[PDB]
Design brief:
This is part of a larger assembly, with chains A (about 240 residues), B (about 240 residues), C (about 230 residues), D (about 250 residues) and E (about 70 residues).
Chain A lengths: L16 H11 L4 E5 L3 E9 L13 E3 L5 E3 L1 E2 L1 H22 L5 H13 L12 E9 L3 E7 L5 E3 L2 E4 L3 H9 L10 H12 L9 E9 L6 E3 L2 H13 L3
Antiparallel strand pairs in A: 1-2, 1-9, 2-10, 3-4, 4-6, 5-6, 6-7, 7-8, 10-11
Helix pairs in contact in A: 2-3, 5-6
Chain C lengths: L17 H11 L4 E5 L4 E6 L7 E2 L7 E4 L2 E7 L1 H22 L5 H14 L11 E9 L2 E7 L5 E2 L3 E4 L3 H7 L10 H13 L11 E7 L2 E4 L2 H11 L1
Antiparallel strand pairs in C: 1-2, 1-9, 2-10, 4-5, 5-6, 6-7, 7-8, 10-11
Chain E lengths: L10 H5 L7 H17 L7 H12 L11
Classes of the chains: A alpha+beta (about 240), B alpha+beta (about 240), C alpha+beta (about 230), D alpha+beta (about 250), E mainly alpha (about 70).
Chain lengths: ~240, ~240, ~230, ~250, ~70
């Protein structure tokens, strides 16, 4: 109280409260997980359908930053879409000024610095969305970076963001992502998403998958339905 | 007295800037501690590498950021602000090299960084970067140099220094240590840094949790010690 | 009148720009600094105490040169002193470029004070929490001025700023004579700092610099050592 | 309250910040000027008379603006410097544009316009400096001009600004003979007024500056009285006071 | 006077120091000297513990955040 009204005021104990509040906004959203294969990165988010009138794909949280980069936002969807636009702009500028695809580490660092710049001023508020970036290229392998409203971003072997972050993390540790390929790990991602779902507080959800790896020739695209359905079947095979 | 701590540009009745002090207190939020020691011909920095999760990529959690080949840094404090400050430092070093030819000395480098921090703390436009910057680098005619320089914009040269949650105890240990004149050798410098951090932390210092970077007169290039050299230094330290 | 002690662009009902006095109080809580003008030169002396032996004493110098014949000593906040010395150097170089003559000390002080005043006229910019003490040797006569965050500048013959400045001022007007010379001025600065100094005054703990006709130069630790040994 | 910023109007229609700035002027040292038939002068009091303070400029309170203008200063030192620098700038700009000296009132009007703009636009505090002006011009000759922090000026024959202004002005109005004052009589009156305007007795010469404006052979020489003539005036006033008490 | 003290301690060594410390500081110095002597199971107060107590009490700056000075 008193020190939490603006993003530029330090608390007496020394913590920017607005950033923590924006974090709490992210924690209020649904779970989005990304698992790095031995040979790629797979994205899966739990997209709740708020009303049945929607169009089985409206306001999707899976965004294509570039040909090889994918984003799996979780949080305030307007801020997430704006951040996806900023990431696309950064990737396009990097490609235009340097001639080659932006490395995932550099893109994550730049988008994080853009995010962190919004926790520095009183006239702007920190972003209310947390997003994870994934890409694959034979030159530098598979990378997966998660960026939260603070602007901090390090690579992850496997990360979750949203309400059931903790449960998704407990389940994802018992997976040996170091050696598995991006084929069965998609079924695993579907199974974890189905485990992390309340189903009595959240009425329904539409599972959407995404990946980038060797089997997608280094590009990021929507997971094909002809194997997304089998991932869903494996998820149903698990009782929860 | 307590009403003057909401804007950085407002002076306390006793003549203090409370927002700057709060930013200083924000440095300890990371829960990490970094210590830097200057030898006769080398400068060694070590810092905690906390990975409280098996799924983190330990390669990307490193707090040692290389400003240039002959200038290195360790950043303690809030992560995002520290990363912004290192990007600014790299830009400043590159601009100095482009504008004057010769590489920027370490003191001048984060003296410019501290000038940026000070202009931040004077004009109330952005919050000061809650991150302490510790610089190293071999400089000609002056030997090794390590300068710690802070959000307030205060920069100084140190024979040894440290910043983080466990700052005062580590500085007291170094005071007890840097009073006995002895050959400050590479081995001895790394050993004394590791002893400082271990004793202040009261931790056995498994090699996976400490990350070390050193610049030497013989090799004036910032080099980050990998697992093998860190373990060798620890075992040489124990015996 | 606690309601008017926040903004810099408002007048108190009594008519006091409260933030200026607050910055002055911040200045007076700074490190001691004393400067004396002798018949042949000017002496600037500040104490430079680190919290530990862990600090390189020679890395940061409280006494800095502006031109070949202008010095700077401060009492207050060092980070503000750095921007102040940078601005003073730029103003001196601009004057030199325009007029092809080393900038007069009075003119340098006036321009520096105008820079200091520039931060005391708008909300959102903090007054410089540091007061400068400026030496100089112009037209064959020594100069000594003090510039405040208020923007006011005067022509102190001899003064002490910072912590325990009252004691330093009381020592002055007692051991200060208008017809002294450079060595006596150095000695007077040494004793003036001494009674405002806690602990032993080492060659690293006190930084001095004379500002005579030969120009301003920061005395090396050897000269401070021999001067202190003569005093001690 | 209605004094949060200068742009706020009180319900009665009073700029409280402006009134605060004017009431603050009394904190400044005493400054006064007397208009005589053959010239005009200014008198100032040095509040800071510390023996450790060197006097190098000899014009800390009275500033020369143009070859035929001068001004006394009372108020905030930084604002004082800013206003005098702007005064010199306006004077030289008018000289460059018209190639004739400023008719005094124009320069005063320029300062008053700047000050009014400062008290009108938001984000700027009023200039807490009230300054007297002296000068000679081809249209009306010797003039004494007064400036307030609000930018309201006015022609005057003799005023006082600073400490104990009201008493000095009242005694000026009591014992000023219109159209019968010479520069010597004006100096004597200024010394008499400054004697008991300030609480300090004996009227030390080191604590008082006087500058006089004269019209000699069309040159308009601005003279600041040195310590010798000031001390001579002090002794003259002392002997006059001794003669006055002889009747007692 | 009431303390046991020792022959080797010379209070004039501590008095002549330029540090400006109040009478409360003197009392604190002496009490810390007694505590240091008692901690080492010694009933006599010597130069070393008195010096260490002096140094401890003299240290009053604490943080000061390094830029106010």
């Amino acid at each position: 109280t008193g020190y939490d009204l603006s993003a530029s005021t330090f608390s007496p104990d020394g913590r920017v409260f607005q950033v923590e509040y924006a974090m709490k906004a992210v924690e209020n959203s649904s779970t989005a997980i990304g698992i790095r294969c031995k040979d790629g990165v797979v994205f899966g988010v739990e997209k709740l359908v708020l009303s049945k009138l929607y169009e089985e794909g409206s306001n999707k949280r899976l965004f294509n930053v570039d040909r090889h980069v994918g984003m799996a936002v979780a949080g305030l969807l307007a801020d997430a879409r704006s951040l996806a636009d900023i990431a696309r702009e950064e990737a396009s500028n990097f490609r235009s000024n340097f001639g080659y695809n932006i490395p995932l580490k550099h893109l994550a660092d730049r988008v994080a610095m853009y995010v962190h710049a919004y926790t520095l001023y009183s006239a702007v508020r920190p972003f209310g969305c947390s997003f994870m970036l994934g890409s694959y290229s034979v030159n530098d392998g598979a990378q997966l970076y998660m960026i939260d409203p603070s602007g901090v971003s390090y690579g992850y072997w496997g990360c979750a963001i949203g309400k059931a972050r903790q449960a998704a993390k407990t389940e994802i540790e018992k997976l040996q992502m170091k050696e598995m390929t991006c084929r069965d790990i998609v079924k695993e991602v579907a199974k974890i998403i189905y485990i992390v779902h309340d189903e009595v507080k959240d009425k329904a959800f539409e599972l959407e998958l995404s990946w980038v790896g060797e089997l997608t020739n280094g590009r990021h695209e929507i997971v094909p339905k002809d194997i997304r359905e089998e991932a869903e079947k494996y998820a149903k095979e698990s009782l929860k | 007295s307590a009403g003057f701590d909401r804007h950085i540009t407002i002076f306390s009745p006793e003549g203090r800037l409370y927002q700057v002090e709060y930013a200083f207190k924000a440095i300890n939020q990371g829960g990490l501690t970094s210590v830097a020691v200057r030898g006769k011909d080398c400068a060694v920095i070590v810092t905690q590498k906390k990975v409280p999760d098996k799924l983190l990529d330990s390669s990307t959690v490193t707090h040692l950021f290389k400003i240039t080949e002959n200038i290195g840094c360790v950043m303690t404090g809030m992560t995002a602000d520290s990363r912004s400050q290192v990007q600014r430092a790299r830009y400043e070093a590159a601009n100095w090299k482009y504008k004057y030819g010769y590489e920027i000395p370490v003191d001048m480098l984060c003296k410019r960084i501290a000038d940026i921090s000070q202009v931040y703390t004077q004009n109330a436009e952005m919050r000061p970067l809650g991150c302490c910057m510790i610089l190293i680098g071999i400089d000609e005619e002056q030997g090794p140099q390590v300068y710690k320089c802070d959000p307030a914009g205060y920069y100084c040269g140190f024979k040894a220094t440290a910043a983080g949650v466990k700052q005062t105890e580590s500085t007291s240990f170094l005071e007890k240590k840097v009073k006995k004149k002895f050959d400050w050798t590479f081995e001895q410098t790394v050993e004394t840094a590791i002893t400082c951090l271990s004793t202040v932390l009261s931790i056995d210092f498994k090699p996976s949790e400490i990350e070390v970077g050193v610049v030497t007169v013989e090799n004036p290039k910032f080099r980050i010690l990998t697992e093998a050299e860190i373990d060798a230094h620890l075992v040489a330290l124990a015996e | 009148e606690r309601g008017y002690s926040f903004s810099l662009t408002t007048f108190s009902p009594s008519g006091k720009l409260v933030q200026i006095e607050y910055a002055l109080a911040a200045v007076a809580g700074g490190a001691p600094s004393v400067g004396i003008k002798a018949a042949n030169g000017v002496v600037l002396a500040t104490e430079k105490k680190q919290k530990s032996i862990l600090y390189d004493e020679r890395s940061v110098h409280k006494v800095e040169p502006i031109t070949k014949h202008i010095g700077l000593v401060y009492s207050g906040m060092g980070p503000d002193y750095r921007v102040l010395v940078h601005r003073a150097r730029k103003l001196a170089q601009q004057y030199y470029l325009v007029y092809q003559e080393p900038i007069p000390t009075a003119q340098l002080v006036q321009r520096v004070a105008s820079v200091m005043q520039e931060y005391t006229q708008s909300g959102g910019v903090r007054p410089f929490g540091v007061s400068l003490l400026i030496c100089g040797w112009n037209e064959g006569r020594p100069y000594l001025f003090q510039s405040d965050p208020s923007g006011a500048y005067f022509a102190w013959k001899a003064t002490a700023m910072g912590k325990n400045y009252v004691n330093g001022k009381t020592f002055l007007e007692k051991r200060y004579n208008e017809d002294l010379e450079l060595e006596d001025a150095i000695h007077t600065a040494i004793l003036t700092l001494k009674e405002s100094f806690e602990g032993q005054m080492t060659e690293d703990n006190i930084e001095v610099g004379i500002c005579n006709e030969a120009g301003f130069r920061r005395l090396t630790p050897t000269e401070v050592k021999d001067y202190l040994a003569a005093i001690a | 309250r209605y004094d949060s910023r200068t742009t706020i109007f009180s319900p009665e229609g009073r700029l409280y910040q402006v009134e605060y700035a004017m009431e603050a002027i009394g904190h400044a040292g005493t400054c006064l000027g007397i208009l005589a038939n053959d010239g005009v002068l200014l008198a100032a009091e040095r509040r800071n008379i510390h023996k450790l303070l060197d006097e190098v400029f000899f014009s800390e309170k009275i500033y020369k603006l143009n070859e035929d203008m001068a001004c006394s200063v009372a108020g905030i030192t930084s604002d004082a410097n800013v206003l005098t620098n702007e005064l010199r700038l306006i004077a030289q700009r008018y000289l460059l544009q018209y190639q004739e000296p400023i008719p005094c009132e124009q320069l005063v009007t320029a300062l008053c316009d700047i000050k009014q703009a400062y008290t009108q636009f938001g984000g700027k505090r009023p200039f807490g400096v009230s300054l007297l002006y002296i000068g000679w011009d081809k249209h009306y000759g010797f003039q004494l001009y007064q400036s307030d922090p609000s930018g309201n000026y006015g022609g005057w024959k003799a005023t006082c600004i600073g400490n104990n202004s009201a008493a000095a002005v009242s005694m000026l109005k009591q014992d000023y003979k219109e159209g019968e004052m010479t520069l010597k009589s004006a100096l004597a009156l200024a010394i008499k007024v400054l004697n008991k305007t300030m609480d300090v007795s004996k009227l030390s010469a080191e604590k008082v500056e006087i500058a006089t404006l004269t019209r000699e052979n069309g040159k308009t020489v601005i003279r600041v009285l040195k310590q010798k003539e000031v001390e001579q005036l002090i002794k003259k006033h002392e002997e006059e006071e001794a003669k006055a008490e002889r009747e007692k | 006077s009431k303390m046991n003290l020792s022959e080797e301690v010379d209070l004039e060594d501590y008095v002549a120091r330029p540090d400006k410390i109040s009478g409360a500081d003197i009392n604190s110095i002496c009490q810390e000297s007694g505590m240091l002597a008692v901690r080492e199971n010694r009933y006599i107060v010597l130069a070393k513990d008195f010096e260490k107590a002096y140094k401890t009490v003299i240290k009053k700056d604490e943080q000061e955040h390094e830029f106010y000075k």
